[PDB]
């Protein structure tokens, strides 16, 4: 079941304007891009693209209200500049298990105003020295990187 199918399977005869949390993981990508979602999704605030073979997020929809996006287990190697404009209100991003290999790749996220968490587990960029410090200086608004704030104090629950 590719995205276009499961989306409708998850649409559940409920109009796109009335979805607030959509879960689409392990499904597929057309070739390496999200296909099936459309801008009519306006009430969505939790999209989970986990394990969907995804080579980029170029053709992502426009979700004003998105706040909890997660692209873990995919193979994004850049092109995150789109997420800034297309998800102005995103405040919880989960890029774990992807193919990011440089701090430069995370430069585009600097212009997201309301960012609160960035999970970056199992990514080749996490093997660097002064990794967390460099990330926290490139993304000053961040207050939880990988789960801990600044002194390795776990992020409080109920987020």
């Amino acid at each position: 079941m590719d995205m276009k199918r499961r989306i409708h399977l998850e649409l559940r005869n409920r109009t796109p304007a009335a979805v607030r949390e959509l879960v689409l993981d392990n499904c597929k990508s057309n070739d390496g891009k999200i296909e099936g979602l459309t801008a009519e999704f306006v009430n969505l605030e939790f999209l989970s693209l986990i394990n969907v073979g995804l080579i980029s997020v170029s053709n992502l929809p426009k979700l004003p209200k998105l706040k909890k996006l997660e692209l873990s287990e995919n193979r994004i190697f850049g092109g995150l500049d789109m997420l800034a404009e297309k998800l102005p209100n995103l405040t919880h991003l989960n890029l774990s298990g992807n193919k990011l290999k440089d701090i430069s790749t995370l430069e585009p996220l600097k212009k997201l105003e309301c960012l609160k968490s960035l999970d970056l587990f199992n990514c080749e960029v996490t093997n660097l020295n002064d990794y967390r410090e460099s990330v926290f200086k490139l993304l000053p608004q961040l207050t939880y990187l990988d789960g801990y704030d600044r002194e390795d104090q776990e992020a409080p629950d109920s987020d």
Binding site: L128, N129, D130, S134
Partner: protein
Amino acid sequence: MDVNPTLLFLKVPVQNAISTTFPYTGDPPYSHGTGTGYTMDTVNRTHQYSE
């Protein structure tokens, strides 16, 4: 960053930070050269240089 301690020599002369290049302060836990092979080789070398 990828830490490269040798790059420290770009700022401090080598003789100032020469201690950096000495790996061990103590007898290592391994035997470097010994046994019948390294003795026969020494005998052969000594005779070769005077053949």
